Write a protein that binds this ligand. Structure first.
Ligand SMILES: [Cl-]
Ligand SMILES: [Cl-]
Lengths: 438, 438
C-alpha cells in the first residue's frame, strides 16, 4: 500500500509545439516548500501519531521520510497522506551522502535540537546563489544556548539547556525562520525572532506547531514570539496549496490568451503576482482563481522582495511574460541576485536580454523561436516550457530532473488545457520529425 | 518431486551466545548473485533444454522461475537442479506486483530483447543507495538500436533490429554488464562494452553464454566483446560457489580465534578479502580454504572497490573484525556510499563508530555487548550474527527475512562449528531466561 518512488530515465524530453490557447481547469497539489518543514516538525511530537494530508508525490518527500525513519520515527506514506509516529526515543544524526544531495535536509536541526538537545546533518556543499549561507541557523541556535559548528562537511548543534532568547536575522530567511521557530517550541523560556520570513509556508508551519500544543504568535508579521512548552502532542494537518505552481499556470494562461481556472488556490498568498499581472492587462478573477489572458501585454518592471513582496520563485517565469510585452522592461532580484542562469537558454529561443548587476534588461516584444533548451533549476524548467507554449515551432526541454523536483504531471496538466505538449524518452525522438509526436 | 518454498513466521529470532570458538568444516552453496542471471540467460536458448546445477534454495530462485514460466518457458526445480525448456514461443512481459518486490527482476530484459526483440518489466521503486539507477541498462539497449522508456512504474525496451554497438558504462555495473552482454549474444554485429564489471559472476555468465554457442571474450577484464550469432542452444552448467558466503565464515573463524575449513571455495575470487585479513594477522591456507584466527587483530583500513578490489558485499561484515582490532581504523565505500544503515545497530552492541562522508571511523578494540538488534539488509543480517559470536552475553537478531535472502541454514552451519546459536519463533523466547535455550 506504501507509495513507491520511480526513477525517470536520464535525458527525457518535454517537447512543446507553441500556438495553442489554454482553456480549462487545473488542480494544485501541496507545496514542497511547506511539506518538508511540516514533516520535520513531526519530530517534536513526543505523544500521539501525526497525520499529514495533501502531501505531494515528490522525491524530497520520500527522502525526508527516510531521514526520519533513520532518526527512529515510524513513517508511512500512502496516497497524499503521511503518518508519523515519533513517540519513541529519537536519535540526532543524519549523516549519509544522500542527505547532502537534498539541500533542504537542514530543516531537521531545529526539531532535533528541541526534542533531543542535539543535531548533526551532512551539508550539501555549494558556493554561489540559488541558496544562501546557513549562518543564521547557527546564530539562532547559539543564542538559544547551543554549541555549534561546521566541520568536515557537517553542521552540528548541541544544547545542554535549550533556552529562549532574542534573535535578530540579518535577512528574512525562510530556512532560518523555520529552524529557530521549531527549536523554540520546547526551549525553556520565550524566544523573540526579529526580521523573520513572512511567507505563507511560515504561517502554515506556525499553525501546525500551535495545533500540537506550542505557543507561537506573530507568524506572517516581521516578528515571531514563541513561549516554550514541556511537550508537544501529535495532530492532523493539511499542507497548504502550492502558490508557486498556481503562479506558473496563471502565467501560462496569461501568455497564451487563455482562460484557465486554477482550483484550490489562495489569492491572498500571491497578491504581489496578481497585482503585477493585472498591470500588464491580465484579468484575474476570484471565482478558485480564474485567469484570462489579453491580446497584448503592457510592459512592466518587476523587483523581487521578501514576502509579501514579489516572490523570487516566480522570477524566471515572470520574465517570459515580460519578453512578450510591448516594450522594454526590467526584472530585478533582491533575494537571490545571481538567479539568472536561465537567461542564456531563453536567448536560444530568440529572446533579447542583458544581465546587468542583479537586474536583467528585457527588450520586448520578442518573437520566440523553438530550440533545444536545458533547464537550469526547478522554476527555470517550467519557465522554458511556458516560453515553448508561445514559441514558433518546437521547443525541446531537457534536464527534467529539475522540473520533477516541484511539479507533478506538469505535461499532463498542460495537455488537459489543450496544449500540444509531450514528454518522451530520448530514444523515441527523431528531431527531423517532431511533428510525428502529438 | 518439485521443490516447495516455505514461508517463515514473522518476527523469528536468531539468538547468539558469544564466547565460543568455531572449529570444523562448512560447505558453500551456489551464489545468488550468479544464479539469477544464469537462469535468465536460459531464455536465449531456442534449442534444447538447459540443466542448471548447484542452484541454491532461495526465494529469488522460486520467483525468477515463476517469471520464466509466465514468459512461456517450462521450468522445473528439484533439489539443487533447475531445468529450463525455452524452445517455445517466448513472451516479453513481466508486469505483476510480485515482480517489483524482487529488485533483481530487471535481469530478464537483455535475454528477452535478444530472443524476442522486446522486454517490459515492473520496476521495484526506491530512491537512496543499496541499489543504483538502471539508466546504464537502457543506455546500452538504446545504443543497440532499441527504443526505451521508464513509464508508469515500468521499464521497457523494443528493437526492430537489435545490432552491435560500442557502449561505455559510466561505472562498472554488474547489472548493466549482465543485461547488455546477454542482449548482445543474438544482436546482428559485434558489441564492445567498456568499463564493465569484472566480478566472478560476470565471468561465469560469460562462460555459460559461450557454452550455448555465443561468442563472448574479455569477461573478467575491463572490456567485453560479443560477436552476435543467429541462435543459441541449451547446455548444462553449474553455478559457481558463493564467494561472499565464503567470506562470512572466514570472518567468523577469524574473530572467534577459530580453525574452520571452508569447502568448495575459490580463493582467486576473494583475493582482496584474503589479503586484507592476512594484514590483520589471520592465517589463510589453500588446502578448500582453511582459516585460523589469531589472539589479537591488527587494525587496518579498508576501502571498497569494484572487483577485483575489496568487495562491497563484505563491507558490513568486515566492520565487525575492524571493531575488534587493536586500534582505530576506517572503512570506506566507493561502490555504495550510503551502505552504512547497520552502524546504528552495532552501536547498540556497544560499538564505537562515526559516519563521516562515505566512511566510518571505527574506534577499536570494542567490548561488544549482547543486545536486541534488527537486521537492515542481507549482509548486515550476517554481520550482526557475527558480532553476536564475540559479544558478551546474548544477542537477539530480528528481521531474518533479509538473512534468508542469501544464506541457507546459516544458524545450523554455525551450530556445526560449535557455536551457541539458535533460531526460534518469537513465542518461544522469554527474554528473562534466554539461557533456557541452547
Ligand atoms: Cl532547484
Ligand atoms: Cl538486501
Amino acid at each position: 500500500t506504501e507509495n513507491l518512488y520511480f526513477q525517470s530515465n536520464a535525458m527525457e524530453k518535454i517537447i512543446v509545439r507553441g500556438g495553442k490557447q489554454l482553456n480549462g481547469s487545473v488542480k494544485m497539489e501541496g507545496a514542497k516548500n511547506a511539506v518538508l518543514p511540516v514533516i520535520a516538525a513531526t519530530l517534536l511530537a513526543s505523544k500521539g501519531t501525526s497525520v499529514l494530508k495533501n502531501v505531494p508525490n515528490l522525491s524530497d518527500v520520500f527522502t525526508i521520510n527516510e531521514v526520519l525513519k533513520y532518526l527512529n520515527a515510524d513513517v508511512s506514506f500512502v496516497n497524499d497522506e503521511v503518518t508519523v509516529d515519533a513517540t519513541g526515543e529519537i536519535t540526532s544524526d543524519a549523516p549519509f551522502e544522500y542527505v547532502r544531495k537534498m539541500r533542504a535536509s537542514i530543516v531537521v536541526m531545529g526539531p532535533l535540537l528541541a526534542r533531543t538537545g542535539s543535531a548533526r546533518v551532512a551539508l550539501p556543499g555549494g558556493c554561489a546563489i540559488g541558496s544562501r549561507p546557513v549562518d543564521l541557523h547557527l546564530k539562532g541556535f547559539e543564542a538559544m544556548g547551543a554549541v555549534v559548528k561546521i566541520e568536515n562537511g557537517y553542521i552540528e548543534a548541541t544544547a545542554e539547556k535549550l533556552v529562549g532568547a532574542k534573535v535578530y536575522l540579518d535577512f528574512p530567511s525562510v530556512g532560518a525562520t523555520q529552524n529557530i521557530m521549531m527549536a523554540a517550541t520546547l526551549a525553556e523560556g520565550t524566544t523573540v525572532i526579529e526580521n523573520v520570513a513572512r511567507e505563507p509556508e511560515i504561517v502554515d508551519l506556525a499553525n501546525f506547531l500551535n495545533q500540537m500544543g506550542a505557543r507561537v504568535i506573530g507568524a506572517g508579521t516581521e516578528v515571531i514570539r514563541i513561549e516554550g512548552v514541556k511537550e508537544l502532542t501529535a495532530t492532523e494537518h493539511s499542507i497548504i496549496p502550492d502558490r508557486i505552481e498556481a503562479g506558473t499556470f496563471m502565467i501560462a494562461a496569461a501568455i497564451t490568451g487563455g482562460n484557465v481556472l486554477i482550483e484550490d488556490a489562495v489569492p491572498e498568498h500571491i497578491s504581489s503576482l496578481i497585482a503585477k499581472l493585472e498591470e500588464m492587462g491580465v484579468q484575474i478573477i476570484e471565482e478558485g482563481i480564474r485567469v484570462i489572458g489579453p491580446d497584448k501585454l503592457k510592459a512592466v518592471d518587476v523587483k523581487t522582495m521578501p514576502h509579501p513582496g514579489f516572490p523570487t520563485d516566480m522570477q524566471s517565469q515572470m520574465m517570459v511574460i515580460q519578453m512578450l510585452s510591448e516594450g522594454t522592461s526590467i526584472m530585478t532580484e533582491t533575494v537571490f541576485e545571481n538567479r539568472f542562469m536561465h537567461v542564456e537558454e531563453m536567448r536560444r529561443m530568440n529572446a533579447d536580454m542583458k544581465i546587468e548587476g542583479h537586474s536583467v534588461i528585457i527588450s520586448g516584444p520578442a518573437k520566440l523561436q523553438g530550440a533545444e533548451v536545458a533547464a537550469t533549476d526547478l522554476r527555470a524548467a517550467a519557465a522554458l516550457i511556458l516560453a515553448g507554449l508561445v514559441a514558433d515551432g518546437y521547443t525541446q526541454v531537457t534536464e527534467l530532473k529539475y522540473l520533477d523536483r516541484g511539479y507533478n504531471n506538469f505535461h499532463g496538466k498542460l495537455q488537459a488545457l489543450g496544449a500540444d505538449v509531450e514528454r518522451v524518452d530520448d530514444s523515441k525522438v527523431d528531431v527531423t520529425n517532431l511533428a510525428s509526436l502529438f
